[model samples]
Target: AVIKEFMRFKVHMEGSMNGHEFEIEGEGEGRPYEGTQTAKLKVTKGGPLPFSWDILSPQFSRAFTKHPADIPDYYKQSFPEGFKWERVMNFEDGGAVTVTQDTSLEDGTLIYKVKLRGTNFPPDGPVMQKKTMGWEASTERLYPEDGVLKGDIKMALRLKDGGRYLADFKTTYKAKKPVQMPGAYNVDRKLDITSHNEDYTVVEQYERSEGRHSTG
Candidate 1:
């Protein structure tokens, strides 16, 4: 069966920082991946799920490794097979965040809605910035509440592994600037992320971005 395709994106931007361009594409069995600078990652449906991906560049893994180690895992794991998350949140104070996507598909598009909350996600210790404690919300929301219930996160993502995701990330730290390391740390750092409470919600809608059709 010829499958359909789609793409989603995000960036890690700090204050006064300019985000880079990203793109994606689809591969075997209707998989998707980040595309060209302007194009972004591609999404498709109907084909078999891809288990492994042929990362276009080593930088791809490097870029993804920068992820918060929490959400990105689910995002990547969900490829080809979506997962059921108990909850997903985003901080505002130091951990600035944003997610975007293109819902257009040959057959239809996918629609997603995200719920955001504000809290000290890393309860036990400092966060990625290792300085900031919390974050603020910028996106609008359907559920109106205080900081606990704010902003509704919405976007579409490809459904296959080996699917590519190419995009820039922008995040703001609590401090004036983030700490820049000279080079990669060969040693892995372990963390007991016992958080006081987490912010945000994953009450997203996972269906055809546009409309569904028959096998015909």
Candidate 2:
């Protein structure tokens, strides 16, 4: 089976502060922003789920008067295979959070639930001036037994030092064209995310590819 799963994204935003009103309607058919990504999953069952991603967008760069984090280097990175399922790992930038995956569930293990408290992720330093102050996510439903992974998410973006732009959101996995074949896992999988609140919204989708597929 040849799996073609990549993320396609769209962002909707509108907000204002003491002096400026910011907005962008960058989402529509055939126009979802393409963010490149790759993943490694074990079909045999209990091992590790690891992946890599990169979101290089000019819009993200100019937004908030300044974009947060490092250069494209900021958006790109890799995570290690978790030998211990339940864990909390801190980014080198002071952003810390814990992840939960309970195996006590009936069909399989719980996918994930994560939270970031007061600090911003990717860390907004002097030059990179945009970032989420805090965020949280809970996985509501998942695939292999359920259709796919669906969940609720929350974001608190700090455009400047004294204000907040909140876009509560949604995330989905195993999201693209589904196919059937032997010896293939996640043969069809993409990521879908949405951010919306009382005043603003951001709908993001990821286009994924598998350079290497593993497991038995």
Candidate 3:
């Protein structure tokens, strides 16, 4: 099979501090980090103070790393060949929680679940203190077929110390159109996230393109 190539994108935003908003517009073509994309934007209401993005400066990890700990042989007995399964929950204060995944096959569907639990030290500082705090999360994912490209993801994160809910989010993927390349497809995704402690809601939308596809 000729595997299709895809480009992933991340957007950075800038605005005022008092929640006052302005309209901005931009356009780009081609894949990121390939030196073939271009974007332009202007702050229509924020005066001559325009909006900008450094296309040359990419941020964050773009790929998943394999699970570091040892997993029991029984956990891998049910999954198909070339299946990559792992779960990692990262916190905002430089802490991380690890969890193990349990897999099963139910009526031609792949079910995976993990209960995230761990303790992390607040990076040697006094603003938040360097103390070990407990955190927990729950995650589950569903794949409909052995080699399907679309799936549903659900997750909830909490602070174990105060029994507080930090974040709850659900993400789902939809098949758009198949690319000309064999064994490849385009996918659109939406994430609905809520933060109780922070008192806010975040909605994110993006497209994953394989081969020749538009991300707009």
Candidate 4:
């Protein structure tokens, strides 16, 4: 129930690079958020790079595990490419899932759209277990750009038991680099993040600045 509702949140994103751009459109069932959601991603690029898989992160690895101790072996067997993972740290449900990631990037913004299409695998590989889950994220650079350092991150996880979780975040900081700041002066940064799920919703924000000042 919760996971289903969480998955029904609408998602749309756009990004650009030096000579290319991409877009993703997601459709949800409507208010109160019900039913399965789908997303379509289209990349506009010039030529092929002669390679195929550009995996970014594992989607089901965390959702399928019961303990933190299980994380390493799961990654070693399920996702050998070392793709980064952002998991629900507290769920104790254990199961098997085949993990795959669809990854892309533009102008330092990284995008990952992952689909968990099944559970438990034989020695061969993923079978037709038919359970489904989805995850996606877009990350902005943490360094100065266009006079401001900013980050926008969005993510959604559809769980196996009809529960879903969602998160959105935005962060900003003054563009003053270390070389641009005067003694005793520093750039302050702010972060805002929101998380929602079947059980609850949480919004968190914080501000902090760190830099060294030269002695007179």
TM-score of every prediction relative to native: 0.19, 0.23, 0.24, 0.20
RMSD of every candidate to native, in Å, equals 20.7, 17.6, 17.0, 18.5
Pick by TM-score: 3 or 4, better one: 3
Q: Give the CA lDDT, 0 to 100, for residue 174 in model 3.
A: 20
Q: Poorest 10 consecutive residues of model 3 by lDDT?
A: 52-61
For residues 1-216, could you state the per-residue lDDT of candidate 2 as single tens digits?
Answer: 011122222333222211223333343222111324321211121111110111111111100111112221111111111111222333434443333321111122112222112233332341123343322221112123243333333333333366544443333333222322112122122332333232223233322222112333
| Model 3: per-residue Cα lDDT over 30-146, one tens digit each | 332221322233333443321111110111111111111231111122233212233344444444433333333333333233233333424342112312122232222323332
Tell me the spans in candidate 2 whose CA falls farther than 4 Å from its real position.
Answer: 1-11, 14-22, 28-145, 150-213
**Model 1, residue 177: C-alpha shift (Å):** 42
The Cα error of candidate 1 at residue 125, in Å, is 17
Worst lDDT run of 10 residues, candidate 2, spans 47-56
| Model 1 local distance difference test score | 0.21
Q: Mind giving the per-residue lDDT tens digits that candidate 4 earns over 109-168?
A: 223444332222222211112232434333322333454334343434454567654444
lDDT of 4: 0.26
Q: How well does candidate 2 score on lDDT at residue 27?
A: 31
Task: Tell me the lDDT of candidate 2.
Answer: 0.25
lDDT over C-alpha atoms for residue 42 of model 4? 28
Question: What lDDT score is found at residue 143 in candidate 4?
Answer: 34
Candidate 3 residue spans exceeding 4 A from truth = 1-84, 121-188, 193-216
Q: What is the lDDT of residue 167 in candidate 3?
A: 26
Which 10 residues in a row give candidate 4 its minimum summed lDDT? 49-58
lDDT of 1 by residue, 18-109 (tens): 12122323221212322111112232221111111111111111111122322222123333322111123233323233332221123222
lDDT of residue 9 for candidate 2 = 25
Best by lDDT: 4
